[PDB]
Amino acid sequence: TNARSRIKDTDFAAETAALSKNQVLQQAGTAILAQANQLPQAVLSLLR
Amino acid sequence: TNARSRIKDTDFAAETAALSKNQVLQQAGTAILAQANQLPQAVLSLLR
């Protein structure tokens, strides 16, 4: 059972940090997407 | 009869101390389980 824990039981002490990192990169990516999806309409309204 | 005593009669001057010691180990084990079963609760409730 101890070997099964070391091979299976997750050491979530770092996996919680990893998943929080993943979700903050998610929010960052969505933020950059939202701010980038405003560039073309702006430059077209500027050149027109 | 004295031979039967020396071979069968418990010299409970030692078995009484053994009973006391075993009761000590039983209570200690109960307390150790009560203390250790709270480790996952604490670590998960505090880390999440």
Coordinates of C-alpha atoms in Angstrom, one line a residue:
Chain A
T1 CA 0.0 0.0 0.0
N2 CA 2.9 2.4 0.7
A3 CA 4.4 1.7 -2.7
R4 CA 1.0 2.2 -4.3
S5 CA 0.7 5.5 -2.5
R6 CA 4.2 6.7 -3.8
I7 CA 3.3 5.6 -7.3
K8 CA -0.4 6.7 -7.3
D9 CA -1.2 9.1 -4.5
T10 CA -0.6 12.6 -5.9
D11 CA 1.7 15.0 -4.0
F12 CA -0.8 17.8 -4.4
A13 CA 1.4 20.1 -2.3
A14 CA 2.7 21.2 -5.7
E15 CA -0.3 20.2 -7.8
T16 CA -2.5 22.8 -6.3
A17 CA 0.1 25.4 -7.2
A18 CA 0.3 23.9 -10.7
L19 CA -3.4 24.1 -11.2
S20 CA -3.6 27.6 -9.9
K21 CA -0.8 28.5 -12.3
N22 CA -2.8 26.8 -15.1
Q23 CA -5.9 28.8 -14.4
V24 CA -4.1 32.1 -14.1
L25 CA -2.4 31.5 -17.4
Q26 CA -6.0 30.8 -18.6
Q27 CA -7.2 34.1 -17.4
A28 CA -4.2 35.9 -18.8
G29 CA -4.7 34.3 -22.2
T30 CA -8.4 35.2 -22.3
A31 CA -7.4 38.8 -21.3
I32 CA -4.9 39.1 -24.1
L33 CA -7.4 37.7 -26.5
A34 CA -10.0 40.2 -25.4
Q35 CA -7.6 43.1 -25.7
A36 CA -6.3 41.9 -29.1
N37 CA -9.8 41.4 -30.5
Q38 CA -10.1 45.2 -30.4
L39 CA -7.1 46.1 -32.5
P40 CA -8.4 45.5 -36.1
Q41 CA -11.7 47.3 -35.7
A42 CA -9.8 50.3 -34.1
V43 CA -7.2 50.5 -36.9
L44 CA -9.9 50.2 -39.6
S45 CA -12.0 53.0 -37.9
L46 CA -8.7 55.0 -37.9
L47 CA -7.9 54.5 -41.5
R48 CA -11.5 55.2 -42.6
Chain B
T1 CA 2.7 -31.0 42.1
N2 CA 5.5 -28.6 42.7
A3 CA 6.9 -29.5 39.3
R4 CA 3.5 -28.9 37.7
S5 CA 3.5 -25.5 39.5
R6 CA 6.9 -24.5 38.3
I7 CA 6.0 -25.5 34.7
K8 CA 2.3 -24.3 34.7
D9 CA 1.6 -21.8 37.5
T10 CA 2.0 -18.3 36.0
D11 CA 4.6 -16.2 37.8
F12 CA 2.2 -13.3 37.4
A13 CA 4.6 -11.0 39.1
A14 CA 5.7 -10.5 35.5
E15 CA 2.4 -11.0 33.7
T16 CA 0.7 -8.3 35.7
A17 CA 3.4 -5.8 34.6
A18 CA 3.0 -7.2 31.0
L19 CA -0.8 -6.6 31.3
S20 CA -0.1 -3.0 32.4
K21 CA 2.4 -2.4 29.6
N22 CA 0.0 -3.9 27.0
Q23 CA -2.8 -1.6 28.3
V24 CA -0.4 1.3 28.0
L25 CA 0.4 0.4 24.4
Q26 CA -3.3 0.0 23.6
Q27 CA -4.2 3.4 24.9
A28 CA -1.1 4.9 23.2
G29 CA -2.1 3.4 19.9
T30 CA -5.7 4.7 20.2
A31 CA -4.3 8.2 20.9
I32 CA -1.9 7.9 18.0
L33 CA -4.7 6.9 15.6
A34 CA -6.8 9.8 16.9
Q35 CA -3.9 12.2 16.3
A36 CA -2.8 10.8 12.9
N37 CA -6.2 10.5 11.3
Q38 CA -6.4 14.3 11.5
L39 CA -3.3 14.9 9.4
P40 CA -5.0 14.6 6.0
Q41 CA -8.0 16.7 7.2
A42 CA -5.8 19.5 8.3
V43 CA -3.5 19.5 5.3
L44 CA -6.3 19.4 2.8
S45 CA -8.5 22.0 4.6
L46 CA -5.6 24.4 4.9
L47 CA -3.9 23.9 1.5
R48 CA -7.0 24.3 -0.5

